[PDB]
Amino acid sequence: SYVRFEVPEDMQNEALSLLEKVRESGKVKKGTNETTKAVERGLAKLVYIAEDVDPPEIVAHLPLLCEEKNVPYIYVKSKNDLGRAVGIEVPCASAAIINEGELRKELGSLVEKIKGL
Amino acid sequence: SYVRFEVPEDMQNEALSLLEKVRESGKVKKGTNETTKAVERGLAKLVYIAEDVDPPEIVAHLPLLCEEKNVPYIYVKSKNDLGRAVGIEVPCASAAIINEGELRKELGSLVEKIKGL
RNA sequence: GGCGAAGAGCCGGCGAGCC
RNA sequence: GGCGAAGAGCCGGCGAGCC
């Protein structure tokens, strides 16, 4: 499996709520192709990788590229929750915040919390 | 009809035979999408348009585009004859010789006779 | 009701392969 | 054999639309 570490549920809820609100005033990429290219292009501020993705090879490359580019990434239980948070009626294996909009502080606190684990 | 002039049957046979041999030492584009783009790009020396194409709007733009680009064009009865001559296993609505290989004079003479119509 | 971020369809490049 | 130059599939691009 591609999941490198365990994320507390309340921090996950914080992450998806943040993603929901960011879609309103920022820019988010949704889907593994858009997310990976956004990371590769140097644009991603925070990427989300679902934990129930099968086969794992859809997203298994995503964590290492994110490590090489020093871009924080977080895990969420279900592709359904991530799909709901980006608001595209279907499950979603990975996503990314590209522009934090007006949610400077909330994003900053969240990313400090990911690096702290 | 999108057929701008009448092409004698014997000129059709000469044209398809020459095209047949040209695939071997020259270069031919096959299908309307490739041919139209190649003429528009200015590389095509001579294009073939089947007369039994349906619906006609598939190839109806080619004659005038070829005129705009000053490219000589000839008509052949059936997309079947053109498809066999360009050597595919399905019908073909239009084609083009872009580089004459070893047939410089033959292509030139053919084009003069086409202008003669 | 169906399909769809496990990528919709559309575009550029190649231009005969896929089951 | 079915589909296929009326564009097969591969690559790049946009990134939610098509039945």
Author numbering:
A (entry chain C), B (entry chain D): 1 to 117
What do the paper's sentences say?
k-Turns are widespread RNA architectural elements that mediate tertiary interactions. The standard k-turn is formed in duplex RNA where a short bulge is followed by G·A and A·G basepairs, and folds to generate a kink with an included angle of 50° between the axes of the two helical arms. We describe a double-kink-turn motif comprising two inverted k-turns that forms a tight horse-shoe structure that can assemble into a variety of shapes by coaxial association of helical ends. Using X-ray crystallography we show that these assemble with two (dumbell), three (triangle) and four units (square), with or without bound protein, within the crystal lattice.
